[PDB]
Structure formats: C-alpha cells, structure tokens
Point group: C5
Chain length 97, copies 5
C-alpha cells in the first residue's frame, strides 16, 4: 500500500453501471518526510475519508475486496484513514481525533 | 485509477477471438498541473467515450469486470467519462 | 494495453512443463516512435517481424486461448491494422 | 518480490473492517550498492518483522495469500525476514 | 515476461509457512543490464549468471505447486537464445 493525502474529487454521470454511487477521491501520493509528490490516483472510498486526511491506498485487484467492491472495475481504493505514522519509533504524523 | 484524455483509436482484424466487438481507444495520461504526459494507453471502451473527452481508466484485472469483459484478455478499460475534477478546491476540469 | 512491434524471439529447453508449446516473442514498446523497453510475450495470433501489436500484461495474458494455468505475464492479443490519433494515422 | 528494510509503522482505527488486527509496517526499498531508496511502501505483516530488519515484500494479489489474508484489500505483504543476500561471492546482508 | 540474469540468492528461516522449500534468486533485469533487480521463486533450477524469463504478478502462482504461495515473481524459463531484429543477442 501507499501513503497519500486526499486532495480532491472526481465526478461523473456516464459510467459503468457497477460504479453507481461510488465516490471518487483524487489522491496525491506522499513521499519521504511527507513530501507532496507529483503523482496522483483516483480511488474509490467506502471508508469516509475527508479532504486533506492521510490515507493508505491499495491498487490492483485488492480494490475489489473493499466492501461491495467485487464486481466493480476499480483498480484503486482507500482502505484506511491514517491515525499515526512513525519512523524508528518516533512520531512524524498524527490525526485529529 | 488514472485520469486520461481520449486522443485516438486502434483497429485490428487478426486478434484473439474473445476480443470480437471490443472498441479500443488510445488514451493519454494526465500529468501534473493540468498537463498531459507523453505516455499513452490502449483501453477497451464499453462506456462510449469520444475524442478529447476526459475519462477514468482502470488497469489490470479490473478491466475484465466491465460489461461483457468476463474472460477477455484486456488489461485496461475506460470505466467513466469525467464531468469534473477538483483538486485542493480548484475546479481543474469541467 | 500497450502498442509494440515484434522485434525478435526467445527459446528455452529448460522450463515449466506448463509452458509447453508456448512461443515467445520479443516486443519493443512504442511511445509515434519506438522505445528502449522490451517485453517477452506469448502469441497464438501469428504476429511476425515488424508487425504492430497490442500487448496485454498481468492476468489478462492467461485469458488468451490455451492461456489458462500458464505462468505468463504478457501476451499479444491483437495485430494492429491502424492506429489513429485525432484526425490522422501514426500507422496503417 | 522486492527487498526492503522495516523503518516504521502506520496505525488506523477507521478502515475496512476486513483489516481489523492488521499490522502495518512502513518499508524502505533497497536500491543499489547496499544503499536504500527514498521510495516507501506500507505492507501487512504476519511474519513478525521489526525495525531495521530486512524483508522480502510481495505485491499485488500475492499479498492476499499470506496466512488469513484471503479477502483482505491489501496489495503488499511481508512474506519473509531475510537472513542473507548474496550478489556473487560477496554478501550484501547477513542477519547474524 | 522479463529477461533477467541471476546474480545471487536470498535465504530466510522466519517466513510464511507456505514458502517452505522455496528457493529465492536475485535477478537483474535487461543489450545489457539495468540497476533494477527483483527477487523471484525458482522451481526450474536456474544458476548464477544464467539468463531467465521472469513472470510477475499472479502468474507466479501458476508455477508448479505455487497456488497459495504469496509470491509475485518467478523464474519460468532458462533462456538458450534471444534474437532481435535479425540478429542474435544471446546464446551459449
């Protein structure tokens, strides 16, 4: 999985029937030391991730194993909203509780 | 999924038999700050996307889960036509 | 899928019993020009030297005819007649 | 698979209920010459890897075949803690 | 599939139980070699410096008895020959 931040949304009306009701988040990947990387992923979200929150994103067939994702033609999804990130036992990020 | 713009088409007669009737679109991947990369993809379209339109492209086995995609040897598919893209509360595309 | 041209072949006598009969093509990826990355791929469609092909990668490749339960990562799934960008042809 | 080193953790209390109990490790991928890259991956661990330990990480559907991983939406897993890595007759890593 | 050569080995004792017996080879991808490596399961019995086809993703589990093995890379063939644009790039 990869760490990213929620940076936006994608909207559509003309799409695969299987994607009705699917909320599309734009994600910006985060690199070393929280770096805002020039790289993004449109991902489905069934967790409830807010703008600017840090998330874990899974890509490939894993996306289809989110709740109700089985028949969905999606290759990226939010599977967790990050509460904490740490390196060598020291905190570098925390979420608003 | 990636954001991409429809830029062309691919046709073929000599092909795996399961691909009969599958429309192929040439797609161009969106880079950064509204720019499109010199990277392309060829994807199946069961949504009905056209030239210059923006779309969501899903890759891998996801493609086989489009309408009639079962057991087709395709690793890329248009799954949505995009109406709007916001990033950091700025309406990048509409 | 990606666009490529058939540039060569690969042979092996020491291999998974599952790859029996499988022919191995070498593909050179295209960018309207061609490019330095290679893919080794299966083919049943009859793609020959210099022909333009569409290559599908990952589990898709096992969905070619007789591809079931073959440990193959990539396959030619079509030979290309035309490729149009906007209002012109990069290739026919 | 890729070789990587364990260099941290991620925690989440709001997530897919399938992932309950899932230990998340932050991994750092080996580049060349014994030197690690600034590319990172968050992977599930059922092997019990710890800080600074070298590991083999498998990605994609492979990650769901770890013990108990069947229907988990995970695309990266630690599948082995490394004892040695060779590149010839030399020894890029030894746990010892 | 990717052309690589075998440049080393990885051993482990604490690991997923399904991987008992699995030999791990270090590979370096491809007319000469890149800084990019991969570690892969070997059931064909490849050796140091030999060229090989590596298959990645779910393909790796369609090797002999790989069904429930958490592996995403596998040596599926030892290469005897590689040909490119009417010219021979590799053989022994």
């Amino acid at each position: 999985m990869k760490i990213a931040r929620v940076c936006g949304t994608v909207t559509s009306t003309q799409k695969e029937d299987t994607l009705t009701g699917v909320k599309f988040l734009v994600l910006q990947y985060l690199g070393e030391d929280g770096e805002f990387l020039p790289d993004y992923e449109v991902a489905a979200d069934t967790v409830g991730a807010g703008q600017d929150e840090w998330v874990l994103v899974s890509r490939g067939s894993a996306a289809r194993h989110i709740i109700n994702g089985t028949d969905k033609p999606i290759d990226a999804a939010v599977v967790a909203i990050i509460d904490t990130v740490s390196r060598d036992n020291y905190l570098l990020y925390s979420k608003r509780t």
